[PDB]
Symmetry: C2
Subunit: 557 residues, 2 copies
Amino acid sequence: MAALTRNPQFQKLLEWHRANSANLKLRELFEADPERFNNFSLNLNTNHGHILVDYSKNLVSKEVMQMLVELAKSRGVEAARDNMFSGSKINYTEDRAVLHVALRNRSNTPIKVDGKDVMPEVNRVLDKMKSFCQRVRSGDWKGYTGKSITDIINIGIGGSDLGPLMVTEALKPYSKGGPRVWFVSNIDGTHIAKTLASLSPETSLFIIASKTFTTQETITNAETAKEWFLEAAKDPSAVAKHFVALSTNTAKVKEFGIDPQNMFEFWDWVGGRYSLWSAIGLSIALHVGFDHFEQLLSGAHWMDQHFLKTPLEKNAPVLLALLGIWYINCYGCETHALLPYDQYMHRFAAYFQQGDMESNGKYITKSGARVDHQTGPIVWGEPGTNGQHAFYQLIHQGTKMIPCDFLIPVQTQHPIRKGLHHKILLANFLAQTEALMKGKLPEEARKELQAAGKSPEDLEKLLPHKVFEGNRPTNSIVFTKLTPFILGALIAMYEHKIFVQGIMWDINSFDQWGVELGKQLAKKIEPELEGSSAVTSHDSSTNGLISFIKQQRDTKL
Amino acid sequence: MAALTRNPQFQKLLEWHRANSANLKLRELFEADPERFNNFSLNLNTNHGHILVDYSKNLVSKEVMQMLVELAKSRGVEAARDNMFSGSKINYTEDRAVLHVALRNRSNTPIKVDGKDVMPEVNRVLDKMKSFCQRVRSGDWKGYTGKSITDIINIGIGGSDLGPLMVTEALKPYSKGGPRVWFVSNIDGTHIAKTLASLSPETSLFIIASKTFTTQETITNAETAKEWFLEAAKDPSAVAKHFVALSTNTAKVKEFGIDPQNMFEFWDWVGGRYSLWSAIGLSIALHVGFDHFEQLLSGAHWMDQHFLKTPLEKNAPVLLALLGIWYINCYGCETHALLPYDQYMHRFAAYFQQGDMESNGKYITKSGARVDHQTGPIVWGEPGTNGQHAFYQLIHQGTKMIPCDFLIPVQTQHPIRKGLHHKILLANFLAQTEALMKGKLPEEARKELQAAGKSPEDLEKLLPHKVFEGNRPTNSIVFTKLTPFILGALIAMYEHKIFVQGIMWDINSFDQWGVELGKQLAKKIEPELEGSSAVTSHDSSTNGLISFIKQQRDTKL
């Protein structure tokens, strides 16, 4: 077996689930205990707003929570956490530290890697970012014709794209006085082409986000951008005015035409999917200003300290992680839905698809043994209320159990019509989790059908269709306002949730060996597509698809 | 029990799966049979491009496919299809026809509901759409100060939002000369506020899209837009120059204050999630032109005819449906990933979240029996290569089985860098399904590590992490180019896939009773949010969350 399944606290939990989970009914749990909300929620005061983590609408009793906390302890969560924070090389397959927490370590307490404090270098790069932000935002940094920069274009993939995109989208109201920001990520030529179409080479600055500065899709996009730029500027020395790098590859950066002074460094202990807090967040700082970026870091730091200092039984990321374990390893739920009732947060779910799924979509444990249990879930979701009119039909009346996190700010950034829109938004946020829990009983639906004037025959036929079984569990995460600080705390909270789950599963949340095979095979296919010759080097499907491509690419429609 | 589970062909299939499925190995299937691609793919010639549906990388043999087709016949798929196309009231809980196929019936062969041909009214509304599009796009239609329209704003949610948004995004290259299009859907005031901030009341045309014309989000947004407009125009007669309605509800459209000549009608037999083909598609036609809209309809019509006339064994939507049944009801896969390698198609997956999940997220059958089997899957995805660098780690090396549809056009709309970007995009499209199929054996990974110069200790430690188990099934759907016609065919193909699955499960794909409870409970909560007094009328969680909102809404941040 594996570490988790051999653990006696896990075995006890699974045994309890087998014998008792059918007796867990949300309606009954609330009726039996008026203190349920009080006992199954955390009201966190950050001093910059409150975050309420209400986990009371979950299929758990006091005893279940106790068993879950005991399991976290006996899986080594507390020790593993302290090891991360101290710079221990917990990314064991790559022999690397895991120190996104250092990037936002506002206290500046030394954190050592190989006996050396990383904080001076973290702060040196932050200082460089601040200076660059002043130069660009003030208009002092001039393009090749002497004009101020109006547009920033981040070119990067995965961890170099999703974070900056999600955060600038979420913090749009804080971008007054900032340049417009654009994100190019797909190798699909559509992405860069449609972006460049709306830009002037005179006033556009490109940020090339790549640690190695050899990333294929990113560098291809970067080179396309440079070609477009040079068509107008006709001067290779002008590239330094319009291109900067988030990288450590000084030689390659200089080769590209970028001034090495404008290379913003980060470190091997910064995972791509944990990198927005580093130099990778430069586009955030440019867009909303460095002050707001520091606030984002500070919110994450607050949550880091919460995670570090708080007993497990009232520790927010730990409890979220444990509820996830309960649903994944005991109920067997494949997915986890993130449903923010906030249009600004429209890329939040997509961000945590990488954060969660690339971290914990794993199957080999620390010992090298294959797991004999489930690991990371499929993360998905769309903002409310839109989801209600798209897929909530399935959540309410389908055949899947789907743990959902509902998220909302109390205060809106746009209190139009004396708060009418936000009142309705809040009402829907509250109603949906209430509905998911309560359902609608036959006696309730029957009276509605009778009042609607349905015949006895029609009523009988329609009745089961109108019944909601309910008992569908949710978390509700409510926060004062979606400020840079609060957003930072929320992202960090989920980062640590993912960490806790990874430790409990005995997997490495911080490597990504599963991307290698696709990369290898793509490099082999690339040169085969050129020219008219038949490709026979693969399986018949791959060959057949290539044949179709070669036959169809010249057809005039 | 239910119709599917009681069916002897289904029980035979399930028994076969139990006894034989573990012996299905994709790598070996391809090695043993050079004709595999040829035997498990459909190359459809539409005369306006080809669509290759390659299902050969699925965990199926000839025997499995035979059993699946026999099951479709035993479940009465052909008769049910014919009933849909003939105007029979197959939406049995609402006693309605299901006639999205009539909307795009280019042949104009009569389709009767209640003994009356629907085609004259379908065509009357299309003619009205054509005339209106000509007037607006030409610049002839003037706003209240006498200026041409520059911006179109669709206000609607769910079925009245997702289709037009997805299609205008996918067909962006065909929008040159057309007005800018905006989509407002969320009640969240951010959505309308940020849209209106970028617009002038003088040159903006609002399209209020709602089947019922009573949806709270849509009517509230519409009223907010009207108030903003009238603050500038100060003349109720000016509304007729700036507001049109797409609806079935003439009375409510009139009540809102829109001229009947500004109403584009559709019918009760047009489901919201099947409505883009109707008047609801007005924003598409305005953006890309009515000619391109007609091409979209024509593509759907081609696929409708394919579905209607083709033997099941060679019928694309039927085969896709059956493969889905195989994975859902035999393998127990919760999800289905849609992965278009096309940035323009970035909202395709989101569209089919509604299309699939709202249709087949059901639990009551035609006989009134509760299902004792799985129904509709959770649909999700992001376009390649973006999804590729986010979550494919889990697809390759997690603990979930995830059927994936990979989609790509052979010809790009933007063949920049002499086709370099598209070459890389195609290579990745091909490599990923190859990688998912093939995997990488321990001995293959061992040789790679040996060649890398790894010590025996370092090799043994890393080895298991580098293994890819493979045997992960995919469909590859490749088409000549993403034109309006081909897009129409692709959407219709999935519509019919969803239909076939619904018939086989004995559920109603065309109602949506599961959205009612949330609406009811939100109406009750709305007035409770007003004032500072505590709410005690709900469960303690709902009460506690309301208390938090009331306590936090006045804090300065």
